[PDB]
Amino acid sequence: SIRIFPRIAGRSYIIYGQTSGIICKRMEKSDNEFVIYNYISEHYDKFLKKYVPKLYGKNNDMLLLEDLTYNYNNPNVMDVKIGARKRKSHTSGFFSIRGYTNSHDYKFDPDEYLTSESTINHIKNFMEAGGENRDKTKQVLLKWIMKLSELANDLFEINLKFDGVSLIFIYDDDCSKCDVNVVDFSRVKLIDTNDQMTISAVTNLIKILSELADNPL
Ligand SMILES: O=P(O)(O)O[C@H]1[C@H](OP(=O)(O)O)[C@@H](OP(=O)(O)O)[C@H](OP(=O)(O)O)[C@@H](OP(=O)(O)O)[C@H]1OP(=O)(O)O
Ligand SMILES: Nc1ncnc2c1ncn2[C@@H]1O[C@H](COP(=O)(O)OP(=O)(O)O)[C@@H](O)[C@H]1O
Ligand SMILES: [Mg+2]
């Protein structure tokens, strides 16, 4: 009956839908995530179509969301919090990696504040499952840079504070397919400027990934 979905991070009840390609995410504290999906739909629908998993509907307090891992034989997933945290400053200055597929193998700890060097090392660890075909893992990095670039650009013209939103990086083991999308709108707020904190997180990730795509080992 109820099949639990293998979350990489967060603390929310998320199960597979009774149907292919869907996950059900419980809104625990309020329905603010629903309000914010709806708001983004009416005000920035281009942003919603390019960067956010499809919201198919609502069932009581469950959101029926597109499963970002569905079209993948062997998905590797990384959750990076790019929005402001509630209290804590970010474990990597401008963002916090919250988890990744096989993070336990590398003694990853989401409470550990990291140097630039540890941060880069953890992202390399997340890429390890993509294997030795060096000039093909960098195709994955470059496609991520392509979308993160457009996202950082588009974020300048969006009057929301993306408190607590994450980037979900995905690539298949065979490196044939990858994507990144914005998730978790539960704490997103209206404002009358753009979100320089969140933009700074994206540009910083664009910087790290660019260094990875370019270094010659
Ligand atoms: O589960 P995450 O995505 O890492 O985010 C959590 C989550 O925030 P929300 O649930 O409001 O999004 C926690 O709430 P719980 O799941 O623990 O109920 C909260 O813990 P507190 O409510 O006790 O503040 C914690 O915040 P923090 O660790 O800053 O106190 C915060 O983590 P972030 O710091 O990454 O926002
Ligand atoms: N649309 C999605 N498709 C696939 N996995 C998802 C999707 N949304 C969330 N996840 C997974 O769930 C985890 C937590 O989701 P998130 O929306 O951030 O919930 P929370 O509010 O509990 O932090 C992510 O780390 C990711 O692994
Ligand atoms: Mg989250």
mmCIF file of C-alpha atoms and ligand atoms in Angstrom:
data_model
loop_
_atom_site.group_PDB
_atom_site.id
_atom_site.type_symbol
_atom_site.label_atom_id
_atom_site.label_comp_id
_atom_site.label_asym_id
_atom_site.label_seq_id
_atom_site.Cartn_x
_atom_site.Cartn_y
_atom_site.Cartn_z
ATOM 1 C CA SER A 1 0.000 0.000 0.000
ATOM 2 C CA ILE A 2 2.321 2.828 1.359
ATOM 3 C CA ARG A 3 5.863 2.850 -0.234
ATOM 4 C CA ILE A 4 8.315 5.346 1.436
ATOM 5 C CA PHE A 5 10.308 7.561 -1.045
ATOM 6 C CA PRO A 6 14.135 7.550 -0.533
ATOM 7 C CA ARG A 7 14.559 11.262 0.505
ATOM 8 C CA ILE A 8 18.222 12.489 0.449
ATOM 9 C CA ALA A 9 17.463 15.275 3.033
ATOM 10 C CA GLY A 10 14.662 17.311 4.728
ATOM 11 C CA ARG A 11 12.323 16.024 7.509
ATOM 12 C CA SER A 12 8.944 15.768 5.583
ATOM 13 C CA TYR A 13 6.733 12.667 5.051
ATOM 14 C CA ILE A 14 7.231 11.839 1.307
ATOM 15 C CA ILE A 15 5.864 8.585 -0.209
ATOM 16 C CA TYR A 16 5.589 7.327 -3.823
ATOM 17 C CA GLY A 17 2.208 8.137 -5.426
ATOM 18 C CA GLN A 18 -0.126 5.129 -6.005
ATOM 19 C CA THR A 19 0.733 6.051 -9.692
ATOM 20 C CA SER A 20 4.045 6.083 -11.708
ATOM 21 C CA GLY A 21 6.100 9.340 -11.821
ATOM 22 C CA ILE A 22 4.498 11.030 -8.745
ATOM 23 C CA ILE A 23 5.577 11.642 -5.114
ATOM 24 C CA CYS A 24 3.212 12.821 -2.340
ATOM 25 C CA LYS A 25 4.766 15.382 0.095
ATOM 26 C CA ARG A 26 2.853 16.192 3.335
ATOM 27 C CA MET A 27 2.618 19.907 4.291
ATOM 28 C CA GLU A 28 3.281 19.553 8.096
ATOM 29 C CA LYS A 29 3.141 23.075 9.685
ATOM 30 C CA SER A 30 1.009 25.106 7.166
ATOM 31 C CA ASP A 31 -0.127 25.099 3.489
ATOM 32 C CA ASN A 32 2.346 27.947 2.661
ATOM 33 C CA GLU A 33 4.134 25.719 0.017
ATOM 34 C CA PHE A 34 0.745 25.406 -1.874
ATOM 35 C CA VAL A 35 0.092 29.210 -1.652
ATOM 36 C CA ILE A 36 3.642 29.796 -3.070
ATOM 37 C CA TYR A 37 3.384 27.231 -5.972
ATOM 38 C CA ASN A 38 0.039 28.933 -6.871
ATOM 39 C CA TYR A 39 1.578 32.459 -6.526
ATOM 40 C CA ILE A 40 4.585 31.512 -8.753
ATOM 41 C CA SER A 41 2.093 29.997 -11.278
ATOM 42 C CA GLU A 42 0.197 33.356 -11.635
ATOM 43 C CA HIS A 43 3.266 35.726 -11.508
ATOM 44 C CA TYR A 44 6.341 33.809 -12.877
ATOM 45 C CA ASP A 45 4.960 30.800 -14.832
ATOM 46 C CA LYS A 46 8.129 30.721 -17.087
ATOM 47 C CA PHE A 47 10.275 30.287 -13.891
ATOM 48 C CA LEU A 48 7.867 27.516 -12.728
ATOM 49 C CA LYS A 49 8.072 25.611 -16.080
ATOM 50 C CA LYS A 50 11.914 25.867 -16.454
ATOM 51 C CA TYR A 51 13.162 25.180 -12.875
ATOM 52 C CA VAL A 52 10.407 23.600 -10.656
ATOM 53 C CA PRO A 53 8.926 20.068 -10.619
ATOM 54 C CA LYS A 54 5.334 20.031 -11.959
ATOM 55 C CA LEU A 55 2.640 20.297 -9.233
ATOM 56 C CA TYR A 56 -0.156 17.981 -10.522
ATOM 57 C CA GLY A 57 -2.613 18.713 -7.652
ATOM 58 C CA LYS A 58 -3.400 18.580 -3.900
ATOM 59 C CA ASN A 59 -5.064 15.802 -1.802
ATOM 60 C CA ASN A 60 -5.951 17.211 1.695
ATOM 61 C CA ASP A 61 -2.433 18.158 3.003
ATOM 62 C CA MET A 62 -0.461 16.072 0.374
ATOM 63 C CA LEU A 63 1.065 17.807 -2.710
ATOM 64 C CA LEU A 64 1.211 15.514 -5.786
ATOM 65 C CA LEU A 65 4.642 16.439 -7.277
ATOM 66 C CA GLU A 66 6.598 15.239 -10.355
ATOM 67 C CA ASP A 67 9.205 12.634 -9.258
ATOM 68 C CA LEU A 68 12.501 14.206 -10.516
ATOM 69 C CA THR A 69 14.190 10.736 -10.240
ATOM 70 C CA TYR A 70 11.527 8.862 -12.298
ATOM 71 C CA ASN A 71 13.173 8.939 -15.814
ATOM 72 C CA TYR A 72 16.529 7.542 -14.471
ATOM 73 C CA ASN A 73 17.858 3.934 -14.292
ATOM 74 C CA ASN A 74 20.484 4.881 -11.616
ATOM 75 C CA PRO A 75 19.858 8.379 -10.233
ATOM 76 C CA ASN A 76 22.511 10.099 -8.080
ATOM 77 C CA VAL A 77 20.791 12.904 -6.087
ATOM 78 C CA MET A 78 22.360 15.863 -4.204
ATOM 79 C CA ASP A 79 20.252 18.279 -2.071
ATOM 80 C CA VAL A 80 21.906 21.738 -1.725
ATOM 81 C CA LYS A 81 20.060 24.363 0.426
ATOM 82 C CA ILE A 82 20.619 27.682 -1.501
ATOM 83 C CA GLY A 83 17.935 29.656 0.436
ATOM 84 C CA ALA A 84 18.507 31.138 3.946
ATOM 85 C CA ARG A 85 18.474 28.579 6.824
ATOM 86 C CA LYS A 86 16.217 29.439 9.828
ATOM 87 C CA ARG A 87 19.022 30.139 12.404
ATOM 88 C CA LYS A 88 22.340 28.490 11.365
ATOM 89 C CA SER A 89 24.661 30.174 8.821
ATOM 90 C CA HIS A 90 25.491 27.930 5.789
ATOM 91 C CA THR A 91 27.952 24.967 6.209
ATOM 92 C CA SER A 92 29.785 26.168 2.967
ATOM 93 C CA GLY A 93 29.350 29.965 3.427
ATOM 94 C CA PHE A 94 26.815 30.709 0.626
ATOM 95 C CA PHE A 95 25.010 27.278 0.614
ATOM 96 C CA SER A 96 24.747 23.969 2.596
ATOM 97 C CA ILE A 97 24.912 20.492 0.943
ATOM 98 C CA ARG A 98 22.160 18.686 2.953
ATOM 99 C CA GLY A 99 22.947 15.216 1.492
ATOM 100 C CA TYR A 100 23.814 13.047 -1.533
ATOM 101 C CA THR A 101 23.459 9.440 -2.839
ATOM 102 C CA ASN A 102 26.194 7.382 -1.009
ATOM 103 C CA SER A 103 27.219 10.309 1.329
ATOM 104 C CA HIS A 104 27.654 7.777 4.222
ATOM 105 C CA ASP A 105 30.574 6.072 2.261
ATOM 106 C CA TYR A 106 32.545 9.412 2.586
ATOM 107 C CA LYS A 107 31.626 10.132 6.269
ATOM 108 C CA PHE A 108 29.507 13.134 5.088
ATOM 109 C CA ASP A 109 27.880 14.971 8.062
ATOM 110 C CA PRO A 110 25.267 17.686 7.309
ATOM 111 C CA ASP A 111 26.126 19.427 10.668
ATOM 112 C CA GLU A 112 29.869 19.784 9.692
ATOM 113 C CA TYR A 113 30.954 23.352 8.634
ATOM 114 C CA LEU A 114 33.287 22.810 5.615
ATOM 115 C CA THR A 115 36.353 24.588 4.114
ATOM 116 C CA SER A 116 36.163 25.422 0.345
ATOM 117 C CA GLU A 117 38.372 22.303 -0.022
ATOM 118 C CA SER A 118 35.961 19.902 1.858
ATOM 119 C CA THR A 119 32.974 21.436 -0.033
ATOM 120 C CA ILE A 120 34.647 20.750 -3.449
ATOM 121 C CA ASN A 121 35.737 17.271 -2.170
ATOM 122 C CA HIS A 122 32.105 16.325 -1.229
ATOM 123 C CA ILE A 123 30.807 17.419 -4.716
ATOM 124 C CA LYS A 124 33.661 15.292 -6.291
ATOM 125 C CA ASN A 125 32.453 12.400 -4.021
ATOM 126 C CA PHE A 126 28.860 12.980 -5.391
ATOM 127 C CA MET A 127 30.290 12.772 -8.986
ATOM 128 C CA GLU A 128 32.340 9.574 -8.184
ATOM 129 C CA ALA A 129 29.332 7.289 -9.073
ATOM 130 C CA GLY A 130 29.514 8.760 -12.657
ATOM 131 C CA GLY A 131 32.802 6.857 -13.163
ATOM 132 C CA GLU A 132 36.149 7.368 -14.944
ATOM 133 C CA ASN A 133 34.905 8.696 -18.379
ATOM 134 C CA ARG A 134 36.273 12.160 -17.369
ATOM 135 C CA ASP A 135 35.179 14.046 -20.548
ATOM 136 C CA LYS A 136 31.472 13.069 -19.952
ATOM 137 C CA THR A 137 31.179 13.771 -16.208
ATOM 138 C CA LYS A 138 32.133 17.317 -17.430
ATOM 139 C CA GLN A 139 29.177 17.173 -19.914
ATOM 140 C CA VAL A 140 26.998 16.594 -16.752
ATOM 141 C CA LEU A 141 28.735 19.563 -14.993
ATOM 142 C CA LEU A 142 28.342 21.818 -18.115
ATOM 143 C CA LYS A 143 24.593 21.029 -18.514
ATOM 144 C CA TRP A 144 24.130 21.877 -14.792
ATOM 145 C CA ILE A 145 26.086 25.157 -15.341
ATOM 146 C CA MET A 146 23.870 25.947 -18.374
ATOM 147 C CA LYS A 147 20.626 25.817 -16.274
ATOM 148 C CA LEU A 148 22.104 27.289 -13.015
ATOM 149 C CA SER A 149 23.378 30.258 -15.158
ATOM 150 C CA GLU A 150 19.881 30.940 -16.619
ATOM 151 C CA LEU A 151 18.419 30.480 -13.087
ATOM 152 C CA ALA A 152 20.818 33.034 -11.451
ATOM 153 C CA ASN A 153 19.993 35.459 -14.330
ATOM 154 C CA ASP A 154 16.165 34.972 -13.984
ATOM 155 C CA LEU A 155 16.349 35.279 -10.126
ATOM 156 C CA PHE A 156 17.290 39.026 -10.520
ATOM 157 C CA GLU A 157 13.734 39.736 -11.856
ATOM 158 C CA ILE A 158 11.818 37.654 -9.185
ATOM 159 C CA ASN A 159 10.523 39.390 -6.005
ATOM 160 C CA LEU A 160 10.526 36.364 -3.625
ATOM 161 C CA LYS A 161 12.773 35.488 -0.636
ATOM 162 C CA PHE A 162 13.597 31.771 -1.275
ATOM 163 C CA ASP A 163 14.080 30.951 2.454
ATOM 164 C CA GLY A 164 14.964 27.250 2.765
ATOM 165 C CA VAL A 165 14.625 26.235 -0.952
ATOM 166 C CA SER A 166 17.031 23.538 -2.251
ATOM 167 C CA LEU A 167 18.647 22.617 -5.573
ATOM 168 C CA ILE A 168 18.162 18.890 -6.384
ATOM 169 C CA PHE A 169 21.084 17.864 -8.655
ATOM 170 C CA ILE A 170 20.483 14.505 -10.468
ATOM 171 C CA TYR A 171 22.640 12.523 -12.948
ATOM 172 C CA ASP A 172 22.335 8.870 -14.129
ATOM 173 C CA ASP A 173 25.282 6.470 -13.337
ATOM 174 C CA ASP A 174 25.893 6.203 -17.166
ATOM 175 C CA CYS A 175 26.100 10.093 -17.347
ATOM 176 C CA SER A 176 23.605 10.018 -20.328
ATOM 177 C CA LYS A 177 21.123 12.341 -18.539
ATOM 178 C CA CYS A 178 21.144 14.988 -15.743
ATOM 179 C CA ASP A 179 19.137 17.967 -14.452
ATOM 180 C CA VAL A 180 18.784 20.383 -11.518
ATOM 181 C CA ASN A 181 15.533 21.899 -10.165
ATOM 182 C CA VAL A 182 14.401 24.197 -7.297
ATOM 183 C CA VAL A 183 12.295 22.477 -4.542
ATOM 184 C CA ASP A 184 10.718 23.218 -1.076
ATOM 185 C CA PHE A 185 8.713 26.498 -1.136
ATOM 186 C CA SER A 186 7.339 25.914 2.441
ATOM 187 C CA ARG A 187 9.171 29.021 3.909
ATOM 188 C CA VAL A 188 9.235 31.234 0.711
ATOM 189 C CA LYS A 189 7.990 34.856 1.318
ATOM 190 C CA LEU A 190 6.818 37.773 -0.884
ATOM 191 C CA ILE A 191 9.227 40.795 -0.927
ATOM 192 C CA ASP A 192 9.624 43.958 -3.147
ATOM 193 C CA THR A 193 13.269 43.241 -4.157
ATOM 194 C CA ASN A 194 15.145 40.137 -5.465
ATOM 195 C CA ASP A 195 17.002 37.634 -3.164
ATOM 196 C CA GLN A 196 20.772 38.461 -3.273
ATOM 197 C CA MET A 197 21.545 35.705 -0.655
ATOM 198 C CA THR A 198 19.974 32.978 -2.919
ATOM 199 C CA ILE A 199 21.516 34.515 -6.117
ATOM 200 C CA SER A 200 24.948 34.503 -4.331
ATOM 201 C CA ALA A 201 24.458 30.760 -3.533
ATOM 202 C CA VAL A 202 23.727 29.952 -7.229
ATOM 203 C CA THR A 203 26.694 32.056 -8.606
ATOM 204 C CA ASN A 204 29.009 30.390 -6.000
ATOM 205 C CA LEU A 205 27.879 26.878 -7.122
ATOM 206 C CA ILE A 206 28.327 28.010 -10.791
ATOM 207 C CA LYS A 207 31.895 28.973 -9.751
ATOM 208 C CA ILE A 208 32.708 25.631 -8.013
ATOM 209 C CA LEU A 209 31.207 23.507 -10.860
ATOM 210 C CA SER A 210 33.103 25.649 -13.491
ATOM 211 C CA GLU A 211 36.419 24.966 -11.618
ATOM 212 C CA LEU A 212 35.461 21.240 -11.716
ATOM 213 C CA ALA A 213 34.525 21.289 -15.467
ATOM 214 C CA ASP A 214 37.904 23.043 -16.193
ATOM 215 C CA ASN A 215 40.597 21.465 -13.894
ATOM 216 C CA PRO A 216 42.781 19.059 -15.928
ATOM 217 C CA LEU A 217 43.436 15.902 -13.721
HETATM 218 O O1 LIG B 1 14.639 19.769 7.224
HETATM 219 P P1 LIG B 1 15.555 20.826 6.497
HETATM 220 O O2 LIG B 1 15.215 21.094 5.086
HETATM 221 O O3 LIG B 1 17.099 20.642 6.770
HETATM 222 O O4 LIG B 1 15.281 22.251 7.245
HETATM 223 C C1 LIG B 1 15.186 22.293 8.713
HETATM 224 C C2 LIG B 1 13.733 22.275 9.141
HETATM 225 O O5 LIG B 1 13.063 23.500 8.745
HETATM 226 P P2 LIG B 1 11.533 23.469 8.277
HETATM 227 O O6 LIG B 1 11.051 22.115 8.661
HETATM 228 O O7 LIG B 1 10.774 24.682 8.963
HETATM 229 O O8 LIG B 1 11.786 23.638 6.722
HETATM 230 C C3 LIG B 1 13.742 22.039 10.696
HETATM 231 O O9 LIG B 1 12.395 21.825 11.207
HETATM 232 P P3 LIG B 1 12.028 20.347 11.688
HETATM 233 O O10 LIG B 1 12.066 19.479 10.469
HETATM 234 O O11 LIG B 1 13.283 20.017 12.610
HETATM 235 O O12 LIG B 1 10.706 20.427 12.550
HETATM 236 C C4 LIG B 1 14.493 23.188 11.475
HETATM 237 O O13 LIG B 1 14.607 22.904 12.918
HETATM 238 P P4 LIG B 1 13.921 23.889 14.049
HETATM 239 O O14 LIG B 1 12.360 23.951 13.671
HETATM 240 O O15 LIG B 1 14.022 23.240 15.398
HETATM 241 O O16 LIG B 1 14.488 25.353 13.839
HETATM 242 C C5 LIG B 1 15.895 23.419 10.899
HETATM 243 O O17 LIG B 1 16.388 24.682 11.419
HETATM 244 P P5 LIG B 1 17.704 24.919 12.344
HETATM 245 O O18 LIG B 1 18.550 23.588 12.258
HETATM 246 O O19 LIG B 1 18.319 26.155 11.565
HETATM 247 O O20 LIG B 1 17.180 25.304 13.689
HETATM 248 C C6 LIG B 1 15.861 23.510 9.369
HETATM 249 O O21 LIG B 1 17.188 23.539 8.982
HETATM 250 P P6 LIG B 1 17.796 24.781 8.167
HETATM 251 O O22 LIG B 1 18.673 25.421 9.269
HETATM 252 O O23 LIG B 1 18.687 24.195 7.098
HETATM 253 O O24 LIG B 1 16.647 25.798 7.789
HETATM 254 N N1 LIG B 2 9.989 16.466 -6.884
HETATM 255 C C1 LIG B 2 10.887 15.680 -6.294
HETATM 256 N N2 LIG B 2 11.328 14.585 -6.959
HETATM 257 C C2 LIG B 2 12.218 13.783 -6.358
HETATM 258 N N3 LIG B 2 12.760 13.879 -5.148
HETATM 259 C C3 LIG B 2 12.288 14.959 -4.499
HETATM 260 C C4 LIG B 2 11.373 15.879 -4.986
HETATM 261 N N4 LIG B 2 11.113 16.853 -4.033
HETATM 262 C C5 LIG B 2 11.850 16.503 -3.008
HETATM 263 N N5 LIG B 2 12.607 15.374 -3.228
HETATM 264 C C6 LIG B 2 13.478 14.688 -2.275
HETATM 265 O O1 LIG B 2 13.003 14.984 -0.984
HETATM 266 C C7 LIG B 2 14.026 15.604 -0.170
HETATM 267 C C8 LIG B 2 13.397 16.680 0.674
HETATM 268 O O2 LIG B 2 12.470 17.425 -0.145
HETATM 269 P P1 LIG B 2 12.058 18.908 0.305
HETATM 270 O O3 LIG B 2 10.986 19.407 -0.603
HETATM 271 O O4 LIG B 2 13.305 19.722 0.468
HETATM 272 O O5 LIG B 2 11.375 18.596 1.727
HETATM 273 P P2 LIG B 2 11.519 19.223 3.205
HETATM 274 O O6 LIG B 2 10.512 20.369 3.347
HETATM 275 O O7 LIG B 2 11.236 18.087 4.140
HETATM 276 O O8 LIG B 2 12.955 19.696 3.291
HETATM 277 C C9 LIG B 2 15.097 16.068 -1.158
HETATM 278 O O9 LIG B 2 16.368 15.987 -0.522
HETATM 279 C C10 LIG B 2 14.956 15.070 -2.316
HETATM 280 O O10 LIG B 2 15.752 13.914 -2.148
HETATM 281 MG MG MG B 3 14.041 20.917 2.178
#
